[PDB]
Amino acid sequence: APVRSLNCTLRDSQQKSLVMSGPYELKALHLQGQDMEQQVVFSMSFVQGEESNDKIPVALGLKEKNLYLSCVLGYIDTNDELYPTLQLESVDPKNYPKKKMEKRFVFNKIEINNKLEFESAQFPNWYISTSQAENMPVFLGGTKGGQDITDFTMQFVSS
C-alpha cells in the first residue's frame, strides 16, 4: 500500500489475556508463564478514517491468521431488531490490510491513559469488550457504563 502498522497483544483492565476460542472467536482469561504463548498477536493498522485528537481510526488483524475483527449487525447473546456484533472475518492476504478498510473493520482507538478503548466506528457507543468472568468470548458491548470491561493495555510486540 503501504499501510502504517504495529504488532501487539492486548490485555483487558483486569489483566486477562486474549486467546483464540475456535477458528472465528476470541476469549479472555487470566494466563500464566509459558501459556502466555497462547495470547493472540494483533496487527494494528492505522487507517485513513475519521481522526480526532483522541480518536485514531485503526483496523485489527490477527497476525499470520488472515483474520480481522469486524463489526456487523446480527443477533446478540441477550445477557427482530439487529445489534452490532464482533466477528472474526477471514480475508484475502493479497488485499489486506489497506488504508481504505471497509467500514466494518474500523475501530476508533481512544487513549484514556494509560488505557485504550476501541469503539466501533460504524456503530458508535459499541466497544470491544470482555466479561469479568474467565473464558468468555470477546464481544461488542459497553453500551451501558460500568457493566462490561472496555479498557485495555497494549503490549508492543514488533513493527
Coordinates of N, CA and C in Angstrom, one line a residue:
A1 N 0.8 -1.2 0.0 CA 0.0 0.0 0.0 C 0.9 1.3 0.0
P2 N 1.7 1.4 1.0 CA 1.8 0.7 2.3 C 1.0 1.3 3.4
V3 N 0.6 0.4 4.3 CA -0.1 0.9 5.5 C 0.7 0.9 6.7
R4 N 0.6 1.9 7.6 CA 1.4 2.0 8.8 C 0.8 1.0 9.8
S5 N 1.7 0.2 10.4 CA 1.2 -0.9 11.3 C 2.2 -1.2 12.4
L6 N 1.6 -1.8 13.5 CA 2.5 -2.4 14.5 C 1.8 -3.6 15.0
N7 N 2.6 -4.5 15.6 CA 2.1 -5.8 16.1 C 2.1 -5.7 17.7
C8 N 1.1 -6.2 18.3 CA 0.9 -6.0 19.7 C 0.0 -7.1 20.3
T9 N 0.0 -7.3 21.6 CA -1.0 -8.0 22.3 C -1.9 -7.0 23.0
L10 N -3.0 -7.5 23.5 CA -3.9 -6.6 24.3 C -4.3 -7.4 25.6
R11 N -4.3 -6.7 26.7 CA -4.8 -7.3 27.9 C -5.9 -6.4 28.5
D12 N -7.0 -6.9 29.0 CA -8.1 -6.0 29.5 C -7.6 -5.4 30.8
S13 N -8.4 -4.5 31.4 CA -8.1 -3.8 32.6 C -8.0 -4.7 33.8
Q14 N -8.5 -5.9 33.7 CA -8.4 -6.9 34.8 C -7.2 -7.8 34.6
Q15 N -6.4 -7.4 33.6 CA -5.2 -8.2 33.3 C -5.5 -9.6 32.6
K16 N -6.6 -9.8 32.0 CA -6.9 -11.0 31.3 C -6.3 -10.9 29.9
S17 N -5.8 -12.0 29.4 CA -5.2 -12.1 28.0 C -6.3 -12.5 27.0
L18 N -6.0 -12.2 25.7 CA -7.0 -12.7 24.7 C -6.3 -13.8 23.9
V19 N -7.1 -14.9 23.8 CA -6.7 -16.1 23.1 C -7.7 -16.6 22.1
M20 N -7.3 -17.4 21.1 CA -8.3 -18.0 20.2 C -9.3 -18.9 21.0
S21 N -10.5 -18.9 20.6 CA -11.6 -19.8 21.1 C -12.3 -20.3 19.9
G22 N -11.7 -21.3 19.2 CA -12.2 -21.8 18.0 C -11.7 -20.9 16.9
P23 N -12.0 -21.2 15.6 CA -11.4 -20.5 14.5 C -11.9 -19.1 14.2
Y24 N -13.1 -18.8 14.8 CA -13.7 -17.5 14.5 C -14.1 -16.8 15.8
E25 N -13.5 -17.0 16.9 CA -13.8 -16.4 18.1 C -12.6 -16.2 19.0
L26 N -12.6 -15.1 19.8 CA -11.6 -14.8 20.8 C -12.3 -15.0 22.2
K27 N -11.5 -15.3 23.2 CA -12.0 -15.3 24.6 C -10.9 -14.7 25.5
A28 N -11.3 -14.3 26.7 CA -10.3 -13.6 27.6 C -10.2 -14.4 28.9
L29 N -8.9 -14.6 29.3 CA -8.7 -15.2 30.6 C -7.4 -14.8 31.2
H30 N -7.3 -14.9 32.5 CA -6.0 -14.6 33.2 C -5.1 -15.8 32.9
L31 N -3.9 -15.5 32.3 CA -2.9 -16.5 32.0 C -1.7 -16.5 32.8
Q32 N -0.8 -17.5 32.6 CA 0.5 -17.7 33.3 C 1.6 -18.2 32.5
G33 N 2.8 -17.6 32.7 CA 4.1 -18.1 32.2 C 4.0 -18.5 30.7
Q34 N 4.5 -19.7 30.5 CA 4.7 -20.3 29.1 C 3.3 -20.3 28.3
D35 N 2.2 -20.4 29.1 CA 0.9 -20.4 28.5 C 0.7 -19.1 27.9
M36 N 1.5 -18.1 28.2 CA 1.4 -16.7 27.7 C 1.5 -16.8 26.1
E37 N 2.2 -17.8 25.7 CA 2.4 -18.0 24.2 C 1.1 -18.1 23.5
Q38 N 0.0 -18.4 24.2 CA -1.3 -18.6 23.6 C -1.9 -17.3 23.3
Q39 N -1.5 -16.2 23.9 CA -2.2 -14.9 23.6 C -2.0 -14.5 22.1
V40 N -3.1 -13.9 21.6 CA -3.2 -13.6 20.2 C -2.4 -12.3 19.8
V41 N -1.5 -12.4 18.8 CA -0.8 -11.2 18.3 C -1.7 -10.5 17.3
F42 N -2.0 -9.2 17.5 CA -2.7 -8.4 16.6 C -1.8 -7.6 15.7
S43 N -2.2 -7.3 14.5 CA -1.5 -6.3 13.7 C -2.4 -5.1 13.6
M44 N -2.1 -4.1 14.3 CA -2.9 -2.9 14.3 C -2.4 -1.9 13.2
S45 N -3.3 -1.7 12.3 CA -3.0 -0.8 11.2 C -3.7 0.6 11.4
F46 N -3.1 1.7 10.9 CA -3.7 3.0 11.0 C -4.4 3.3 9.7
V47 N -5.7 3.4 9.7 CA -6.5 3.6 8.5 C -6.9 5.0 8.3
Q48 N -7.1 5.3 7.0 CA -7.5 6.7 6.6 C -9.0 7.0 6.8
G49 N -9.3 7.0 8.1 CA -10.7 7.4 8.5 C -10.8 8.6 9.3
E50 N -11.8 8.8 10.2 CA -12.0 10.0 10.9 C -11.2 10.1 12.2
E51 N -10.1 10.9 12.1 CA -9.3 11.2 13.3 C -9.7 12.3 14.1
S52 N -9.8 12.1 15.4 CA -10.0 13.2 16.4 C -8.6 13.4 17.0
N53 N -8.4 14.4 17.9 CA -7.2 14.5 18.6 C -7.0 13.2 19.4
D54 N -8.1 12.6 19.8 CA -8.0 11.3 20.5 C -9.1 10.3 20.1
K55 N -9.2 10.2 18.7 CA -10.0 9.1 18.2 C -9.3 8.7 16.9
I56 N -8.3 7.8 17.1 CA -7.5 7.4 16.0 C -8.0 6.1 15.3
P57 N -8.4 6.2 14.1 CA -9.0 5.0 13.4 C -8.0 3.9 13.1
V58 N -8.3 2.7 13.5 CA -7.5 1.6 13.3 C -8.2 0.3 12.8
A59 N -7.5 -0.6 12.2 CA -8.0 -1.9 11.9 C -7.2 -2.9 12.8
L60 N -7.8 -4.0 13.2 CA -7.1 -5.0 14.0 C -7.2 -6.4 13.3
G61 N -6.0 -6.8 12.8 CA -5.9 -8.1 12.2 C -5.3 -9.1 13.1
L62 N -5.4 -10.4 12.9 CA -4.7 -11.3 13.7 C -3.5 -11.8 13.0
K63 N -2.3 -11.4 13.5 CA -1.1 -11.6 12.8 C -0.9 -13.1 12.3
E64 N -0.6 -13.2 11.0 CA -0.4 -14.5 10.4 C -1.7 -15.4 10.2
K65 N -2.8 -14.9 10.6 CA -4.0 -15.7 10.5 C -5.0 -15.3 9.4
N66 N -4.7 -14.2 8.7 CA -5.6 -13.6 7.7 C -7.0 -13.5 8.2
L67 N -7.1 -13.0 9.5 CA -8.4 -12.7 10.1 C -8.4 -11.2 10.5
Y68 N -9.5 -10.6 10.5 CA -9.7 -9.2 11.0 C -10.9 -9.2 11.9
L69 N -10.9 -8.4 12.9 CA -12.1 -8.1 13.7 C -13.0 -7.2 12.8
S70 N -14.3 -7.5 12.9 CA -15.2 -6.6 12.2 C -16.5 -6.5 12.9
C71 N -17.2 -5.4 12.7 CA -18.4 -5.1 13.4 C -19.6 -5.2 12.4
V72 N -20.5 -6.1 12.7 CA -21.6 -6.4 11.7 C -22.9 -6.6 12.5
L73 N -24.0 -6.1 11.9 CA -25.3 -6.3 12.5 C -25.7 -7.7 12.6
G74 N -26.2 -8.2 13.7 CA -26.6 -9.5 13.8 C -27.5 -9.7 15.1
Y75 N -27.6 -10.9 15.7 CA -28.3 -11.1 16.9 C -27.2 -11.2 18.0
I76 N -27.6 -10.7 19.2 CA -26.6 -10.8 20.3 C -27.1 -11.8 21.4
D77 N -26.1 -12.1 22.2 CA -26.3 -13.1 23.3 C -27.7 -12.9 24.0
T78 N -28.0 -11.8 24.5 CA -29.2 -11.4 25.2 C -28.9 -11.2 26.7
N79 N -27.8 -11.7 27.2 CA -27.3 -11.4 28.5 C -26.3 -10.3 28.5
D80 N -36.3 -9.2 16.6 CA -36.4 -8.7 15.2 C -35.4 -7.7 14.9
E81 N -35.1 -6.8 15.9 CA -34.1 -5.8 15.8 C -32.6 -6.4 15.7
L82 N -31.7 -5.7 15.0 CA -30.4 -6.2 14.9 C -29.4 -5.3 15.7
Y83 N -28.4 -5.9 16.2 CA -27.4 -5.2 17.0 C -26.0 -5.4 16.5
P84 N -25.0 -4.5 16.8 CA -23.7 -4.7 16.4 C -23.1 -6.0 17.1
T85 N -22.4 -6.8 16.3 CA -21.7 -8.0 16.8 C -20.3 -8.0 16.3
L86 N -19.4 -8.6 17.1 CA -18.0 -8.7 16.8 C -17.8 -10.0 16.0
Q87 N -17.2 -10.0 14.8 CA -16.9 -11.2 14.1 C -15.4 -11.3 13.8
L88 N -14.9 -12.5 13.6 CA -13.5 -12.6 13.1 C -13.6 -13.1 11.7
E89 N -13.3 -12.2 10.7 CA -13.5 -12.4 9.3 C -12.2 -12.8 8.6
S90 N -12.2 -13.9 7.8 CA -11.1 -14.2 7.1 C -11.0 -13.3 5.8
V91 N -9.8 -12.9 5.4 CA -9.6 -12.0 4.3 C -8.5 -12.6 3.4
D92 N -8.6 -12.1 2.1 CA -7.5 -12.4 1.2 C -6.3 -11.6 1.5
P93 N -5.2 -12.4 1.9 CA -4.0 -11.7 2.3 C -3.4 -10.7 1.3
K94 N -3.8 -11.0 0.0 CA -3.4 -10.2 -1.1 C -3.8 -8.8 -1.0
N95 N -4.9 -8.5 -0.4 CA -5.5 -7.2 -0.4 C -5.6 -6.5 1.0
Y96 N -5.2 -7.2 2.0 CA -5.3 -6.6 3.4 C -3.9 -6.7 4.1
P97 N -3.7 -5.6 4.9 CA -4.5 -4.5 5.1 C -4.4 -3.5 4.0
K98 N -5.2 -2.5 4.1 CA -5.2 -1.4 3.2 C -5.6 -0.1 3.9
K99 N -5.2 1.1 3.4 CA -5.6 2.3 4.1 C -7.1 2.5 4.0
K100 N -7.7 2.1 3.0 CA -9.2 2.2 2.8 C -9.9 0.9 3.2
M101 N -9.9 0.6 4.5 CA -10.6 -0.5 5.1 C -12.1 -0.3 5.0
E102 N -12.8 -1.4 4.6 CA -14.3 -1.3 4.7 C -14.7 -0.9 6.1
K103 N -15.8 -0.2 6.2 CA -16.2 0.4 7.5 C -16.4 -0.6 8.7
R104 N -16.8 -1.8 8.4 CA -17.0 -2.8 9.4 C -15.7 -3.1 10.2
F105 N -14.6 -2.9 9.5 CA -13.3 -3.2 10.1 C -12.7 -2.1 11.0
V106 N -13.3 -0.9 11.0 CA -12.6 0.2 11.6 C -13.1 0.5 13.0
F107 N -12.1 0.6 13.9 CA -12.3 1.0 15.3 C -11.6 2.3 15.6
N108 N -12.3 3.1 16.4 CA -11.6 4.3 16.9 C -10.9 4.0 18.2
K109 N -9.6 4.1 18.1 CA -8.7 3.9 19.3 C -8.7 5.1 20.1
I110 N -9.2 5.0 21.3 CA -9.3 6.1 22.3 C -8.4 5.9 23.4
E111 N -7.5 6.8 23.6 CA -6.5 6.6 24.7 C -6.8 7.4 26.0
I112 N -7.4 6.7 26.9 CA -7.6 7.2 28.3 C -6.6 6.6 29.2
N113 N -5.5 7.4 29.3 CA -4.2 6.9 30.0 C -4.4 6.2 31.3
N114 N -3.7 5.1 31.4 CA -2.8 4.6 30.4 C -3.6 3.5 29.6
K115 N -4.9 3.7 29.4 CA -5.7 2.6 28.9 C -6.3 3.0 27.5
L116 N -6.6 1.9 26.7 CA -7.1 2.1 25.4 C -8.5 1.6 25.4
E117 N -9.4 2.2 24.6 CA -10.7 1.7 24.3 C -10.8 1.6 22.8
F118 N -11.6 0.6 22.3 CA -11.7 0.5 20.9 C -13.2 0.6 20.5
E119 N -13.6 1.7 20.0 CA -15.1 1.9 19.7 C -15.3 1.6 18.2
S120 N -16.4 0.9 17.9 CA -16.8 0.7 16.6 C -17.0 2.0 15.9
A121 N -16.3 2.2 14.8 CA -16.5 3.5 14.0 C -17.9 3.5 13.3
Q122 N -18.3 2.3 13.0 CA -19.6 2.2 12.3 C -20.8 2.3 13.3
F123 N -20.6 1.8 14.5 CA -21.7 1.8 15.5 C -21.3 2.4 16.8
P124 N -21.4 3.7 16.8 CA -20.9 4.5 18.0 C -21.5 4.0 19.3
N125 N -20.7 4.0 20.3 CA -21.1 3.5 21.7 C -21.0 2.0 21.9
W126 N -20.5 1.3 20.9 CA -20.3 -0.1 21.0 C -18.7 -0.3 21.0
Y127 N -18.2 -1.1 21.9 CA -16.8 -1.2 22.1 C -16.3 -2.7 22.1
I128 N -15.1 -2.9 21.8 CA -14.5 -4.2 22.0 C -14.5 -4.4 23.5
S129 N -15.1 -5.5 24.0 CA -15.5 -5.8 25.4 C -15.1 -7.2 25.8
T130 N -14.8 -7.3 27.1 CA -14.7 -8.6 27.7 C -15.6 -8.7 29.0
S131 N -15.9 -9.9 29.4 CA -16.6 -10.2 30.6 C -15.6 -10.2 31.8
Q132 N -16.1 -9.9 33.0 CA -15.3 -10.0 34.2 C -15.0 -11.5 34.4
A133 N -15.8 -12.4 34.0 CA -15.6 -13.8 34.2 C -14.5 -14.4 33.3
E134 N -13.9 -15.5 33.7 CA -12.8 -16.1 32.9 C -13.4 -16.9 31.7
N135 N -12.7 -16.9 30.6 CA -13.0 -17.8 29.5 C -14.3 -17.5 28.7
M136 N -14.7 -16.3 28.8 CA -15.9 -15.9 28.0 C -15.5 -15.2 26.7
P137 N -16.4 -15.2 25.7 CA -16.0 -14.6 24.4 C -15.7 -13.1 24.5
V138 N -14.8 -12.6 23.6 CA -14.7 -11.2 23.4 C -15.8 -10.8 22.5
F139 N -16.4 -9.6 22.8 CA -17.7 -9.2 22.1 C -17.8 -7.7 21.9
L140 N -18.8 -7.3 21.2 CA -19.1 -5.8 21.1 C -20.1 -5.5 22.2
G141 N -19.7 -4.5 23.1 CA -20.6 -4.2 24.2 C -20.2 -2.8 24.8
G142 N -20.4 -2.7 26.1 CA -20.0 -1.5 26.8 C -21.0 -0.3 26.5
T143 N -22.2 -0.6 26.1 CA -23.2 0.4 25.8 C -23.7 1.1 27.1
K144 N -23.7 0.3 28.2 CA -24.0 0.9 29.5 C -22.8 1.0 30.4
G145 N -22.5 2.1 30.9 CA -21.3 2.3 31.7 C -21.2 1.3 32.9
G146 N -20.0 0.8 33.1 CA -19.7 0.1 34.3 C -20.3 -1.3 34.4
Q147 N -20.6 -1.9 33.2 CA -21.2 -3.2 33.1 C -20.2 -4.2 32.5
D148 N -19.6 -3.8 31.4 CA -18.6 -4.7 30.7 C -17.2 -4.1 30.9
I149 N -16.2 -4.8 30.6 CA -14.8 -4.3 30.5 C -14.5 -3.8 29.1
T150 N -14.2 -2.5 29.0 CA -13.9 -1.9 27.7 C -12.6 -1.3 27.6
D151 N -11.8 -1.4 28.7 CA -10.4 -0.9 28.8 C -9.4 -1.9 28.5
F152 N -8.3 -1.5 27.8 CA -7.2 -2.5 27.6 C -5.9 -1.8 27.8
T153 N -4.8 -2.5 28.0 CA -3.5 -2.1 27.8 C -2.9 -2.8 26.6
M154 N -1.9 -2.1 25.9 CA -1.3 -2.7 24.7 C 0.1 -3.1 25.1
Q155 N 0.6 -4.2 24.7 CA 2.0 -4.6 24.8 C 2.6 -4.7 23.4
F156 N 3.5 -3.8 23.2 CA 4.2 -3.7 21.8 C 4.9 -5.0 21.6
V157 N 4.7 -5.6 20.4 CA 5.4 -6.8 20.0 C 6.5 -6.6 19.0
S158 N 6.2 -5.9 17.9 CA 7.2 -5.6 16.9 C 6.6 -4.7 15.9
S159 N 7.4 -4.2 15.0 CA 6.9 -3.4 13.9 C 7.4 -3.9 12.5

